[PDB]
Amino acid sequence: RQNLKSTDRAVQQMLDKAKREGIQTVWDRYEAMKPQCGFGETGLCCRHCLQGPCRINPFGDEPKVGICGATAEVIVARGLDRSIAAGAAGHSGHAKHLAHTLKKAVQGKAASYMIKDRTKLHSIAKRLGIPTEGQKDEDIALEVAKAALADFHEKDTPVLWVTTVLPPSRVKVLSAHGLIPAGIDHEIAEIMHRTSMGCDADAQNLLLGGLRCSLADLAGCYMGTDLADILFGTPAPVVTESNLGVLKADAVNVAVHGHNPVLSDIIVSVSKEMENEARAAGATGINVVGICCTGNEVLMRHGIPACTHSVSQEMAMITGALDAMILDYQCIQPSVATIAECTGTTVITTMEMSKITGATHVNFAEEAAVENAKQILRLAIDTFKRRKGKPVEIPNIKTKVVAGFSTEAIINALSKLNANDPLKPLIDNVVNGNIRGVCLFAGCNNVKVPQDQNFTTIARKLLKQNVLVVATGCGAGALMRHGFMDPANVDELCGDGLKAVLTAIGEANGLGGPLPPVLHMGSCVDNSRAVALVAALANRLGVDLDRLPVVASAAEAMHEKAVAIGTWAVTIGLPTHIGVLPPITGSLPVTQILTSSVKDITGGYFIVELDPETAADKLLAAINERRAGLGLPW
Amino acid sequence: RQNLKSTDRAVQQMLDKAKREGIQTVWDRYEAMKPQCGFGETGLCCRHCLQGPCRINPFGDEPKVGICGATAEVIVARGLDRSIAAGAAGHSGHAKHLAHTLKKAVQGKAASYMIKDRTKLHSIAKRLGIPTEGQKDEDIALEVAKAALADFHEKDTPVLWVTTVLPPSRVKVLSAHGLIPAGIDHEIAEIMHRTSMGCDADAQNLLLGGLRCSLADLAGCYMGTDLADILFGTPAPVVTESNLGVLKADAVNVAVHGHNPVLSDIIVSVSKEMENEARAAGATGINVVGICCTGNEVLMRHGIPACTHSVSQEMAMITGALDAMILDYQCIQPSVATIAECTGTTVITTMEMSKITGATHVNFAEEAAVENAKQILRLAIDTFKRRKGKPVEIPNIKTKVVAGFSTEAIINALSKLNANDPLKPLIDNVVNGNIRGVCLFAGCNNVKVPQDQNFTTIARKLLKQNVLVVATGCGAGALMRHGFMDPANVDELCGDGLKAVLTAIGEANGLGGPLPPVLHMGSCVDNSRAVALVAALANRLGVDLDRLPVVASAAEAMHEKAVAIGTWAVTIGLPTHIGVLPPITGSLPVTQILTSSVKDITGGYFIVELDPETAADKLLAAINERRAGLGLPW
Ligand code: SF4
Ligand code: SF4
Ligand code: FES
Numbered sequence A, B: 001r002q003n004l005k006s007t008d009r010a011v012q013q014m015l016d017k018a019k020r021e022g023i024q025t026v027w028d029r030y031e032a033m034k035p036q037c038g039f040g041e042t043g044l045c046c047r048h049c050l051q052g053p054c055r056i057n058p059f060g061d062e063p064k065v066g067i068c069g070a071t072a073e074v075i076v077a078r079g080l081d082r083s084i085a086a087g088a089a090g091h092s093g094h095a096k097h098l099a100h101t102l103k104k105a106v107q108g109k110a111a112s113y114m115i116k117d118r119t120k121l122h123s124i125a126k127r128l129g130i131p132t133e134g135q136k137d138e139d140i141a142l143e144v145a146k147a148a149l150a151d152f153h154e155k156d157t158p159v160l161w162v163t164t165v166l167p168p169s170r171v172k173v174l175s176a177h178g179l180i181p182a183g184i185d186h187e188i189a190e191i192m193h194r195t196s197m198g199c200d201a202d203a204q205n206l207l208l209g210g211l212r213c214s215l216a217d218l219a220g221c222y223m224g225t226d227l228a229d230i231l232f233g234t235p236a237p238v239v240t241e242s243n244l245g246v247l248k249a250d251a252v253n254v255a256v257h258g259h260n261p262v263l264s265d266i267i268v269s270v271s272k273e274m275e276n277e278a279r280a281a282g283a284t285g286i287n288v289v290g291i292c293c294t295g296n297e298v299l300m301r302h303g304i305p306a307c308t309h310s311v312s313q314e315m316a317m318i319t320g321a322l323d324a325m326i327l328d329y330q331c332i333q334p335s336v337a338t339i340a341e342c343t344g345t346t347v348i349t350t351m352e353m354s355k356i357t358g359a360t361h362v363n364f365a366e367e368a369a370v371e372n373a374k375q376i377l378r379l380a381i382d383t384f385k386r387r388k389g390k391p392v393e394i395p396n397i398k399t400k401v402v403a404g405f406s407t408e409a410i411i412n413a414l415s416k417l418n419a420n421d422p423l424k425p426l427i428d429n430v431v432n433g434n435i436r437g438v439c440l441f442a443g444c445n446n447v448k449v450p451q452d453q454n455f456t457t458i459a460r461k462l463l464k465q466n467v468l469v470v471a472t473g474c475g476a477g478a479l480m481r482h483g484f485m486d487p488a489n490v491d492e493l494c495g496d497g498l499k500a501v502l503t504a505i506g507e508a509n510g511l512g513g514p515l516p517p518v519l520h521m522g523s524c525v526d527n528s529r530a531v532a533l534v535a536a537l538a539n540r541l542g543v544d545l546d547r548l549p550v551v552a553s554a555a556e557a558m559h560e561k562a563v564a565i566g567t568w569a570v571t572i573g574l575p576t577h578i579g580v581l582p583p584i585t586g587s588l589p590v591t592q593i594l595t596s597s598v599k600d601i602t603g604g605y606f607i608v609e610l611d612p613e614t615a616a617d618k619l620l621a622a623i624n625e626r627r628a629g630l631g632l633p634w
């Protein structure tokens, strides 16, 4: 019964194919892992020194405490902090890569890269205090790249990709609690230090450290978006398609998978130049498709169709038509390298610190980006030739996707209703009730949850109650694959007030129809775009973020990066739902801090709820409490 | 039967007292943890995402692979890499603290701190390429502190506290394999990134990353020693005592515990000024004693007696005479805060990122160091007053300890036998067989091993075979508490050739007797001093470190810091014994790399051996293989 594994019908069809062919999947590896360890599930396990492993029974008798004396609340808080630091290390490493790429580009060392969005470059420079008047663009960009790199270490200022992106009143709240990061890698290292044996052993102190490290993660996200927009262009509305039916039996199908547009953006451009070489090999052309966030990046900027996401990534290979899978880093199931032996796909790694045994490695260098891309795409063309005459099974299933809603694009769309005060039309309709509030869906799928079931169940309940829904990452992936980014579904999905607003904006932008039911704001680093929108609304209203009717939902969370994002959503002031259990329930004191008493520190809080209907009710209650706090009807 | 817990008789006596008083100890918490989880013991557990916990059966049937596809060798290598990064985060955080302290001192912001060792300052400056001619000392020091801080991030040079401290030929070997760190916190963050879900998944690639991060740890160690020597003085030979009998019923007994001399050095000086205030309270004075590495720091520089170490730290409190325990960070069992409720001890934390629930916190600031020290010591005096008329049980057990053998001190001692070529007398006696080789004992005690049993068993076997033995950290602690730093024990412990050499050096230095059987080279960061000595020998001989008859033994290892140290010992070219099982045996491929094929990369290798007699035989075989490689008899 494949609908217990995934609610996506294309995924179900490929699970049937994998089963009859004897190809083990993520769902099979999960079944083989059951029952999972309940010490790990509850957070009551520690391996931070060679006296371990230590564990604590959630209930009953001994063991009650770690060998060194570490209590349940210390063990739980230390493990959580390490997860936050690991997420911060991923988002900001991504950002550091892009900062080095921009520096190389403007120093004449990588001519495949350039300043594509000069408007974005100048606005970032102004936000940071970098002078622009009478400066060459390449010198402004060099200063921006140097400022980005400087935020990784201690200096005379705090992390500017925190303090220049939130309103002063929020910065003041955070500073009063010691939560502003001093440097991105500085905080990651401090976490690893304080959580090592015989160091920090006070749950509140540990968790304050975690909140601060989560803001280092936010800075890496915001830096990643800023730099990718400079290099590759700020997204604007675009129309494309999603799901496995975007693969084409007659073409060389190339998936870009992983995270950084420094890689996927060049593949997209070079693939167009290699069309005739692909035709010489018997193909119609090169069909680049997206998986995971790298896919989101090229979907947002270029309309490249999204093949699949997260938990179902192996299924693209099961079709038999995926000639290459080009990988950077993060969220790539290493099973892809073994499955490729069965399906024929050429899996190619490109980054020095992210290799997979059995996959071909092609060192990417920005200085040689075009030549490296051609070498990679020629491996793909060779693989296509090997499947001449082989039948494939591509499910004929795809949805229409309108996307590209950067914060700049949302403001521009609203400006068609009020040119000199673009945020006011949105605020007006929150006040009059046509928009109840805003919910950001973020983060992964997780094999424990039938794929997409929480995202779609929650989104349906909120849309019917007139909530404006925005989405990133594989939450955007889930919603796009189920039709939530097709404006043809507005009538079925949206309450009357929300429909009226989406229609007024869309028609004022010439569409003759509404905006889509859900606004796709991009990749996981592009959660920073939602921060920019919410901060702009707070500044326009003269209130802090913890008074706005805005919530977040990591409805099917998996990666350490999603834990970090959820934690900074709480830290900036949002009620934040998580739809899978993080390893915290073994400590009531820690759970109480994260779901209740953190409200008194930052105004945000976690809502841990595995039942999606109940989660939607709790998210609506959180929105309505904010409305009442502003004196609004609800 | 307390000798199964500790071979230290003072510890045994306090275990009997804890038992009759119902005070739970580390050994009781260990017993309550048995049997420990064998997935964790073997390394076959992963909690790096919210699909976990995942585990792999070492043998048998499913589960055989992680849910995402992570193999046993990936899971084992990722966990090990995180442990190395966490150790690096501790040693280098320590170093960063000292760099900020030096900067503040020379900028006029902390007058309790100063340049105490001008010779060391100028030599470090010269080693780094910083000009000294016609510069003020405060400006040279500012440049040294800024260079230290710069090594934490990427810049135009690699980490100079690696590349300027090893011989060029070793740097070249490491560079050829990509192992030179680019920045200390940069590498820590890269590790956390590459080991997060869906990133690096090739065991060799992961382990190369770990070796590089271990060199970031070495840099933090060497930086810590350098900066502590500038601020507090380079050690020279000193005589003191060790074990619980250094406590005095009639005095205010104050333990300094944790790591950084920025704290313990001021306590020592201020305590002398407060003698009359202590006498006013009915005490004879303030008796400062050491625990763990902070204790080693003040023992090496000032002859402060060492009370206890590592695993037995709770026993100092059980005496009833410990009025205060002043903590910084690292290796402090958090049980001390609960035990204090029973024993009366005032436990005081001082660092913002290392608090313990139930312990009094007194914020230390360098700018207020003397005033903070007096506040702390007045809490101790008040506590002494509360135990007026209370009997105490201080075991009347202590050993004589000769220590203070910095590398500068060892060279100076040798220079009395050859003034213009001080290393030659040591080399001469290696060649003629009076010295078989050199063994460094490093790292912790571990509750799994009867306390000190591996250190003493191995040391006895090596000393009888004419090995020169040096020691740091709680390996030095174990050996000092069992008489291995008392020159009166040379006749009993040392082979005839080693005795002849220790006697010739000692008599040439005026002692009328030998150097002690083991040379104490200091704290855990001061393992860097052993690197300086070995590098100087390599440079004098014109060979790389992997040709010298030098080995290391982390005979009872516990902390993530000890894993990092063991790993950089392997990376710089040494055969390196570890006497407890690291979580690697669940993967034969990983174990084979770490114990065998790494020899072909760095020339070093791990020797995993839990039986100490067998470990000594394997260490001697490793020394003798090096002798034969140099064409020497053995
Ligand atoms: S840090 Fe404490 S709780 Fe964790 S493994 Fe070590 S002894 Fe056990
Ligand atoms: S990273 Fe892979 S092996 Fe580790 S917990 Fe997640 S699914 Fe399991
Ligand atoms: S005891 Fe299972 S996660 Fe450690």
Ligand code: FES
Binding pocket: A037, A040, A045, A053, B037, B038, B039, B040, B041, B045, B046, B053, B055
């Ligand atoms: S299953 Fe015990 S350490 Fe995870």
Ligand SMILES: [Fe+2]
Binding pocket: A259, A292, A293, A330, A331, A473, A524
């Ligand atoms: Fe992602």
Ligand SMILES: [Fe+2]
Binding pocket: B259, B292, B293, B330, B331, B473, B524
């Ligand atoms: Fe130590």
